[PDB]
Design a protein around this nucleic acid. Structure first.
Ligand SMILES: [Mn+2]
Ligand SMILES: [Mn+2]
Lengths: 612, 161
DNA sequence: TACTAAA
């Protein structure tokens, strides 16, 4: 006769890890009805009395918001009833996994529930979905004793998990309400605009028949970025530079190519006058020197955005493919969670052990042994969003064990980790100033003193250059072959995936797990094509769509309305507003926008006609 | 006296036409050179000035400019930056000033850095060029020690652009 | 026949 507690985690790996940490080696595990989640059992002490423990997991969201059946027909509802005269219900996601029945059967006899879900904003929504699923089955309360608990945690270690188990709290309802409002707004906007656009353009122009034209708070701004870059590329007028350079042949062995102080002149006559007052001279007089000492900063902790950017730039992999490779590596047990945002190592991390494991690879052996022998530099402090620890290696690997596609990702991850643990790079910069008549020139050079992370990240290395000659002020050197060079401005090139990811992160469009999905969606809808160098080129459909959007109502494309709506929705998250009021106001303003849009589509048709 | 006033303008640096000073005077009861200068400074130069700048200064031949004189700015452009991006800071700032005395137009280049002249300088302002000014390939070389801004308030069409 | 987003 002793009570039982039930603990739900957001992923089976997290569930097993927390169970093993809280249970000192005694853990009885068995599979469940789903076959995708496991149940772990242990005996401990909770609320001053002996208790049995039961740990289980749920794979992400349990439910998603969808319309009723009658309004999912696309041919019996006016795409304006979706705003204020359409009921919405929550339906199971991944129905093959009977999450609701699994939770109901596992929570038949429990007295306390502890939600070990992620500390994200949607973690609370998942918490309340689980509570809705489980609560009507729990064995009463038998008084005023509290039965709902939530633990706040960010790192998977011993001390942090123990402190979280000692510092329980309560869940939050306002965050769940905010997430629900966001879901409802997104559905009732996208499913209303997409239906109208698809049903319209499929009845006039037959070229794009059996094609889907989608609108949303993320896809449209993402396409707008690329088409606006295309607009800059098209609207460009090249100009003509005029740069002046000179050569000095001091010490009779070296020919220094000096750089003009004034970097460019846009007038031919002015450039000619400067050239005239300079070339009839046969000496160059030194004026000043410099021997300043600088340093290149070591990289910060790894983040999903940086990993995606590097995979797209250097390794030449798409965001979706990189995410799939990272997920497979994580589920096989080689790297941590590949969807974090934190750039700050937890204070209780086992950095020394993680670096000590990779002490046998022929690539890093010398560097790792040197670091372990002469101590480790502390990592740079960064953002500490309470989502997950950064991406760090967890097990040794060899090129034979892993495949030729995941080996490069693993190599980059471990090299980044070693670079973060390692020292900095120190280079001496020397600048020498010359005078040839009225004008001035400068010559610059670098010489590395003590390489740091360079030997682990050889592509982020200072180039080797010949050391500048010694010279004190007042010395004179022979100068020859001063001339004028003509150059023209180069137009900008199309957006790359790295730049698009940077822009999306800056403007707050899409989450960590949503950027690859949105990029793949805009690639699949034939809005943008992918060319050499991982460049995204807009197509005719995308160009005409965004131009029509700008001509009709630009507020649907500009990359700030998403941030404004998020700010408005934060009000109910902080308790300063009302869910019904905010949702009604936003739905009303968007409905007015849709009604203005519907009777002004000729502006987009007049641009569609010439394209198709 | 009229001769005294004209001479006073002469050493002051203003070279104005006789009809110009006749038109710009307030009242020939008690005229003061200071008020004449103050009221002339706020008007366009093309209608009051005279011809003192020698010809051919647009081209070469001439080498040095003597006398302080007074010139009016018609347009200012940042040479070291492209037309589209005039606020770029990738280059040291060079300014080309189109200058006039009412009859002949000349061009000047900022050889060194001057803080008293900026990109958003109101067109029509007046500049004094005391000393000896260098002429190179028909360009007036301007330095900070030989150019003085006398200010200017003349109706602006710059705001239209 | 789909749609939007989010773990
Ligand atoms: Mn999560
Ligand atoms: Mn996140």
């Amino acid at each position: 006769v002793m009570k039982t507690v039930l603990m739900v985690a957001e992923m089976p790996s997290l569930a097993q890890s927390i169970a093993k940490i809280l249970s000192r080696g005694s853990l009885s595990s068995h599979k469940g009805l789903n076959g995708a989640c496991s149940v772990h059992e242990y005996t401990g002490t909770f609320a001053g009395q002996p208790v049995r423990f039961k740990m289980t997991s749920v794979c992400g969201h349990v439910m998603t918001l969808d319309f009723l059946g009658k309004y999912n027909k696309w041919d019996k509802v006016d795409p304006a009833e979706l705003f204020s005269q359409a009921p919405t219900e929550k339906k199971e996601a991944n129905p093959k996994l009977n999450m609701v029945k699994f939770l109901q059967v596992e929570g038949r006899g429990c007295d306390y529930i502890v939600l070990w879900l992620d500390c994200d904003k949607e973690g609370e929504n998942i918490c309340f979905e689980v509570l809705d699923a489980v609560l009507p089955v729990m064995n009463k309360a038998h008084g005023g004793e509290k039965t709902v608990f939530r633990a706040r945690f960010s790192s998977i270690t011993d001390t942090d998990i123990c402190n979280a188990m000692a510092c329980l709290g309560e869940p939050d309802h306002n965050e769940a309400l905010s997430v629900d409002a966001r879901q409802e707004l997104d559905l009732r906007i996208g499913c209303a605009f997409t239906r109208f656009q698809t049903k319209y353009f499929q009845g006039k122009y037959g070229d794009l028949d059996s094609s889907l034209i989608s609108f949303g708070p993320c896809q449209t701004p993402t396409l707008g970025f690329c088409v606006e870059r295309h607009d800059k590329i098209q609207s460009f007028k090249p100009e003509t530079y005029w740069v002046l350079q000179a050569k000095v042949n001091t010490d009779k062995d070296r020919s220094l190519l000096l750089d003009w102080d004034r970097v460019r002149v846009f007038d031919r006559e002015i450039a000619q006058m400067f050239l005239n007052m300079t070339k009839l001279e046969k000496e160059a007089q030194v004026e000043a020197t410099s021997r300043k000492e600088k340093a290149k900063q070591r990289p910060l902790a790894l983040n999903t955005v940086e990993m995606l950017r590097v995979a797209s730039s250097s390794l030449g992999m798409g965001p979706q493919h990189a995410m799939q490779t990272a997920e497979r590596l994580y589920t096989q047990g080689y790297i941590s969670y590949p969807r974090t945002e934190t750039t700050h190592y937890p204070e209780n991390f086992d950095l020394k052990g993680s670096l000590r494991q990779q002490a046998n690879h022929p690539y890093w052996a010398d560097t790792v042994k040197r670091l372990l022998a002469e101590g480790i530099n502390r990592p740079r402090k960064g953002h500490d969003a309470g989502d997950h620890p950064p991406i760090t290696p967890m097990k040794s690997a060899t090129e034979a064990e892993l495949g030729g596609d995941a080996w490069r990702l693993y190599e980059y991850i471990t090299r980044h980790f070693i670079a973060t643990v390692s020292h900095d790079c120190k280079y001496l910069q020397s600048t020498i100033s010359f005078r040839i008549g009225p004008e001035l020139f400068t010559c610059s050079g670098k010489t590395v003193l003590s390489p740091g992370f360079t030997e682990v990240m050889p592509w982020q290395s200072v180039p080797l250059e010949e050391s500048l000659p010694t010279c004190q002020r007042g010395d004179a050197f022979p100068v020859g072959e001063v001339k004028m060079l003509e150059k023209q401005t180069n137009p900008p090139d199309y957006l790359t995936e790295a730049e698009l990811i940077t822009l999306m992160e800056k403007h707050g469009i899409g989450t960590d797990a949503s950027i690859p999905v949105h990029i793949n969606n805009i690639c699949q809808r034939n809005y943008v094509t992918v060319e050499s160098g991982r460049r995204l080129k807009p197509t005719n459909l995308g160009i005409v769509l965004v131009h029509g959007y700008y001509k009709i109502d630009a507020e649907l494309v500009l990359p700030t309305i998403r941030s404004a709506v998020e700010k408005q929705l934060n009000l109910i998250a902080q308790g300063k507003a009302d869910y019904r009021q905010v949702l009604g106001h936003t739905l009303d303003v968007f409905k007015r926008k849709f009604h203005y849009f519907v009777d002004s589509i000729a502006g987009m048709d007049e641009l569609m006609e010439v394209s198709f | 006296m009229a001769q005294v006033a004209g001479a006073a303008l002469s050493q002051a640096g203003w070279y104005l036409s006789d009809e110009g000073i006749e038109a710009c005077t307030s009242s020939p009861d008690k005229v003061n050179v200071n008020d004449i200068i103050l009221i002339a400074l706020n008007t366009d130069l093309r209608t009051i000035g005279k011809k003192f700048l020698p010809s051919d200064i647009n081209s070469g031949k001439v080498e040095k400019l003597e006398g302080p004189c007074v010139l009016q700015i018609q347009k200012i452009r940042n040479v070291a930056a492209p037309k589209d991006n005039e606020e770029s800071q990738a280059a040291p700032r060079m300014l080309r000033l189109q200058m006039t005395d009412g009859h002949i137009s000349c061009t000047a280049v900022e050889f060194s850095y001057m803080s008293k002249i900026s990109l958003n300088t109101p067109p029509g302002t007046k500049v004094k060029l005391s000393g000896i000014v260098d002429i190179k390939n028909g360009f007036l070389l301007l330095n900070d020690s030989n150019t003085t801004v006398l200010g200017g308030e003349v109706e602006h069409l710059i705001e239209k652009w």
